[PDB]
Amino acid sequence: LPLMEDVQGIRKAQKADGTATVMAIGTAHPPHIFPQDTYADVYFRATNSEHKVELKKKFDHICKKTMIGKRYFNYDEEFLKKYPNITSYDEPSLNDRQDICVPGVPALGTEAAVKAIEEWGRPKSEITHLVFCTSCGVDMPSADFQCAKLLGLHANVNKYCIYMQGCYAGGTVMRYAKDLAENNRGARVLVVCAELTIMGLRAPNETHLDNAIGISLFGDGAAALIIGSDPIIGVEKPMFEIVCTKQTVIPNTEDVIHLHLRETGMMFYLSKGSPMTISNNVEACLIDVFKSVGITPPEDWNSLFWIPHPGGRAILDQVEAKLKLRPEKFRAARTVLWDYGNMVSASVGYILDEMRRKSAAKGLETYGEGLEWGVLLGFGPGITVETILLHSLPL
Amino acid sequence: GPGMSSLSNSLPLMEDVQGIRKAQKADGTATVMAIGTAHPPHIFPQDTYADVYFRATNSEHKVELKKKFDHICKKTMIGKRYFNYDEEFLKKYPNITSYDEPSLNDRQDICVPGVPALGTEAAVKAIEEWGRPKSEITHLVFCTSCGVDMPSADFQCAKLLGLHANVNKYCIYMQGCYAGGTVMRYAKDLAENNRGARVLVVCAELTIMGLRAPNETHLDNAIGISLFGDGAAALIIGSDPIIGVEKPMFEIVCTKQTVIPNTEDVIHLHLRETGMMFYLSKGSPMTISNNVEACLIDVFKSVGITPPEDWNSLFWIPHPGGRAILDQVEAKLKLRPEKFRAARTVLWDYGNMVSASVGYILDEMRRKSAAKGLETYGEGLEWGVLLGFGPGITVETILLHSLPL
Known part of the structure; x- marks a missing residue:
């Protein structure tokens, strides 16, 4: 020994x-x-x-x-x-x-x-x-x-x-x-x-x-x-390097999205206002993931590639508006929401797949739409936000 | 310390x-x-x-x-x-x-x-x-x-x-x-x-x-x-x-989870409209004991350490899934009757508290070791193993190194 x-x-x-x-x-x-x-x-x-x-x-x-x-x-x-x-x-x-x-x-x-x-x-x-x-x-x-x-x-x-x-x-x-x-x-x-x-x-x-x-x-x-x-x-x-991963709980928002497993199965509860809570706090989560690794956040969020969880059309619309993103930035997420709906934990994997496949088909510089840095976002009960900072590699 | 603010560890x-x-x-x-x-x-x-x-x-x-x-x-x-x-x-x-x-x-x-x-x-x-x-x-x-x-x-x-x-x-x-x-x-x-x-x-x-x-x-x-x-x-x-x-106190050196083949119907629990339904077929203490040594050999070899010839050279924190599991694992590893004392004390005073049991045993071990003025927190010994047993049958083997008092 x-x-x-x-x-x-x-x-x-x-x-x-x-x-x-x-x-x-x-x-x-x-x-x-x-x-x-x-x-x-x-x-x-x-x-x-x-x-x-x-x-x-x-x-x-x-x-x-x-x-x-x-x-x-x-x-x-x-x-x-x-x-x-x-x-x-x-x-x-x-x-x-x-x-x-x-x-x-x-x-x-x-x-x-x-x-x-x-x-x-x-x-x-x-x-x-x-x-x-x-x-x-x-x-x-x-x-x-x-x-x-x-x-x-x-x-x-x-x-x-x-x-x-x-x-x-x-x-x-x-x-x-x-x-x-x-x-x-x-x-x-x-x-x-x-x-x-x-x-x-x-x-x-x-x-x-x-x-x-x-x-x-x-x-x-x-x-x-x-x-x-x-x-x-x-x-x-x-394809994608997982540089920084942070989970965040938004305070005083437990009553917004909650699900209970009962004798009747899973009971879904959603209050009016979830897209607003997510969108108003997303930027703070992004600044946090960048600061944690010492990288200065970009002045324009359009400089990054995006894999946002398609919790709904309203969540995507409001996050897009808050980050001042052009309509094509969420293209991969919008196509997955259309073709497959919200597949819970599986949705972001589908978007990441769609992104790298289209990037390879268009002959772009990297797997992340030709861009270097990007973020994968998960949103759900809590309200909880999972912020995953990714660095894409060349083809 | 971590040296979060040190230059060699700066971003x-x-x-x-x-x-x-x-x-x-x-x-x-x-x-x-x-x-x-x-x-x-x-x-x-x-x-x-x-x-x-x-x-x-x-x-x-x-x-x-x-x-x-x-x-x-x-x-x-x-x-x-x-x-x-x-x-x-x-x-x-x-x-x-x-x-x-x-x-x-x-x-x-x-x-x-x-x-x-x-x-x-x-x-x-x-x-x-x-x-x-x-x-x-x-x-x-x-x-x-x-x-x-x-x-x-x-x-x-x-x-x-x-x-x-x-x-x-x-x-x-x-x-x-x-x-x-x-x-x-x-x-x-x-x-x-x-x-x-x-x-x-x-x-x-x-x-x-x-x-x-x-x-x-x-x-x-x-x-x-x-x-x-x-x-x-x-x-x-x-x-x-x-x-x-x-x-x-204890350094977590190697951690491996193992499934014993063809034993799915031995320990199984289902969450139904009537709550958690517990099922246990006969033979669980013997099945766990006949596969535990292979799990220990795996955890030691995975970190380049030659498995000890005598298992008594180590301190132990086995999950007290029952007195029969403890008795048979002890017998198979040719351990002395006191090797599982900390585990038996917790089983006596608190029963099987599921995931909380090993934490209680680790606490009992370090406290008794300090109270007796022993060399280390792990009964005066350097190397030891924490074991979890449950549905699958699944064995969690955690190799520990105890630090001095």
Whole structure:
């Protein structure tokens, strides 16, 4: 056994040299397409609420201004008929939601993980850490265990299960991955964000009007990333360096966005004013992430590339206005919101994928729209903001 | 110390990625520098537990199931446990004291604000021992298998403690009995990769999330009711201890999580409309013992150290998942009867407090070592291992190096 003076030598040999880097991104979504134009008709039919005509035109109006074109779900109208308790308002339904989400979320997550590992090109045996993230379903052993099992990873992979961190969770996974990759030499972190919104699906009511915003917004999906420090030249393809990661809680705003897991499943609550709270405090979070690494914030926010969580059209519009950004800056985020809706923790992964793919297709200088520095933002319950400072690399 | 303000650790003037990384990372090994513990006020002695439990659950008519549970309680090696409820509190909830009546909502109403409250009590003690301002805590790792909510338990704990708005939070939900090991694994990477970082680890559990009446088809639920107790443990972990201010105790050298293949149906828990449903198949103490040595060899080889020929050369903090797990792990590793004394003392006085158990044992070990005037906090020994066991079956192996007194 080594002496007291040898402990530091072990630490020096154990840690990685460089910055945690995104080197692969894979995405997946379930097969059932639900267009937004017909969503009011399909939802009110599936929930047997066709008699509530005045509540239907209210929901149709909300759906029409979401700037979401389609969403993907693990269910169709035929599947929902097998579970009448999920399609009702307050009937006991957690057991059925868990029966679907507990095995379903890691299954969907694994699909995205397979694509990320295939792009990466190295054997799955080289994955040392797994960070799984979901707000849909909880179990013991957890979703991380199930994902590792489905992928057939090594028995000694260090796993991290990020449960119920909502819409900011896509930022949280980058924060976790940064420390895991950088503090462990040779470590390759597989990040998986997967969500199945059936955990929150229910019938509309007059007392729960804020539930209508959630049903018009959330879609199913999964995103997976391979993150690691010290990229192997000629084998791996380094894209985004995770330089600084900070989580912030906005004071006196707990009553704004809150969700509870009850006997009726996930109960969504949203007060009028969330886009204002997020937009008014986003700049302070950005100045903080830049100051933490000694970089002077740019005079013009258009100088950076952006991956904002598409919590809704209003959140994107207000953050864009506050930071005085040109319409093309949030292009990648707007396309993902349109094509896929809000896929919870998986949305930012989809945007990061869209950004690097379009940058490579246009033949730009870097993966981050030809620009050097950028920010990935997560927004959710708290109100909590996850600010991830990224440095993009050349093609 | 971290040397946050020193020139050699200063941030580069230009936007140099590698220069930023060099300044941002810490130098040394993550070190435990404070441990605080807490438990609810209601004392439930184990010798009268069978009587109290069967009366509170309206099951005193099942005479042959009572004599079976009385025999399980007598063999647990638990003397007393603490709970956030008494017999009067349970009478307000007939649904929790039944077997399968709808009860999740009521359990959530107790556990969602209750777990962060109990955790905060332990955290206040850890912060007081540490001695530095609470505003200097940069990371919070909260851990519990009792209750889930959005915003999570970490948010509530941070709010009750009055931590900085910019504290980086980690919520470890439903990782069960191995979670006390998982928090050490999280804390290691967080403290070591961030210069100046001081991680507050909080493990808190309220077993009312799993309390229910006995049944003839669910005989394995009786093992859980005779075992689990409430409690909280909190630790302050950080790299590069400040000499003269902080008191460095245990260095977290290597941390690995291992899954034992083909054992998913051995230890499993499900969160249902009836709360947390506990399932335990026969063979868990032997399955854990037959795979523990391989986990230890892995943790030692991962840092280039040759595994000791005699396991008695190390100090031990094993999760007291039951007296049988302790007895069989001790036997397989050919350990002397006193090697697990700290673990057995905590099991006797507090029972199995889930993720909080190992924190209590680490506290017991360092306190007894200081009280006897020993050479180090780890029973006078230099190297040791903290072990967590739970659903999977998953083993958390934490290699520790104790510093001198």
